[PDB]
Amino acid sequence: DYTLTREIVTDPLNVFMGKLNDMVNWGRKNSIWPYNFGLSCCYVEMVTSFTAVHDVARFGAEVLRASPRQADLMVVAGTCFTKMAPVIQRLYDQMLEPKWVISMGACANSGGMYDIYSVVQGVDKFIPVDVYIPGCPPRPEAYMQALMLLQESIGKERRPLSWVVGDQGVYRANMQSERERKRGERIAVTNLRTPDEI
C-alpha cells in the first residue's frame, strides 16, 4: 500500500527499473545529511548522538550541513515556537528534493508539555513529518532508532529517476505501525527489574 503525492494507490513497480530504484533508494538511505538546526534541548540530545559515545557517523549521517540546500533531512529537534515557525517553514522550503523530516521530542510532535500561548502545537501543523520520536528528550539512541526507521521508509519509496522521463509522482509506503509491530513482544513482558538497584 502506497500514498501518492503529485491518494492511496498500489505499488507502481520492468525488472531493470526496479533495480535502479532500489539502487537509488539504497544510496539515499545510506547517505542522509541532516541540517544543523537547533531549537531546544532535543537538539542537545541529537548532537550527543553525533559524538564518540554513540557515533551516528557509522550510519553515514554525520555530515551536518549548515545550508538547507546541502541537507537531505530536517530534524525538528525542539519546540516550534511561534516566532520560529516561519523560520522553520522557510528553511524547509529552502531544502531540495528529496527531503525528509524527523520530528524529535514531545514539543515537535505535539507541543508536548507546552500547551501555551507562544508555542505551535506540533510541527505537523504546517510541515509534513516522516518519523516521529516520543520523548522529552528522546535519548540519542532513540534518535538513531528513528534514523533507522527513516532508512526503512526510504528503502521502499518510489521516486522518479529523472525529471524528464517517466512518472514524476512521489510514492511513500504505508508501513505497518511500530506499535502494532511490537505489540506482540511488548504485551508478553511479565517481570521487570525492581527500581531499588543500579
Partner 1 sequence: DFLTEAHLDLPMEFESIGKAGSRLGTALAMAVDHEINMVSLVRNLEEFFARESCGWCTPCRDGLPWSVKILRALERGEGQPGDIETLEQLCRFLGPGKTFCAHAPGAVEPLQSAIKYFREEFEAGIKQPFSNTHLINGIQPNLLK
Contacting residues toward ligand SF4, per CB under 6 A: 40-42, 78-79, 105-107, 112, 136-137
Q: Which of 34, 61, 39, 42 lies closest to 139 in space, CA to CA?
A: 42
25 or 49: CB nearest ligand SF4:
49
Query: Residue 68 binds what, of ligand SF4, partner 1, none (CB under 5 to 8 Å, by partner type)?
Result: none
3-state secondary structure of 165: coil
Say which entry of ligand SF4, partner 1, none residue 137 contacts (CB below 5 to 8 A, set by partner kind).
ligand SF4
Size of the site for partner 1 (CB under 8 A): 3
Question: Binding mask 155-194 vs partner 1 (x if CB under 8 A, - otherwise)?
Answer: ---------------------------------------x
Residue 177 bridge partners (DSSP): none
Q: What three-state secondary structure class fits 33?
A: coil
The Cα–Cα gap between 118 and 94 comes to 25
Quick check: bond before 86 cis, omega within 30? no
Could you say which of partner 1, ligand SF4, none residue 196 binds, taking C-beta under 5 to 8 angstroms by partner kind?
partner 1
198 part of the interface to partner 1, by CB under 8 A: no
Three-state secondary-structure class, residue 174: coil
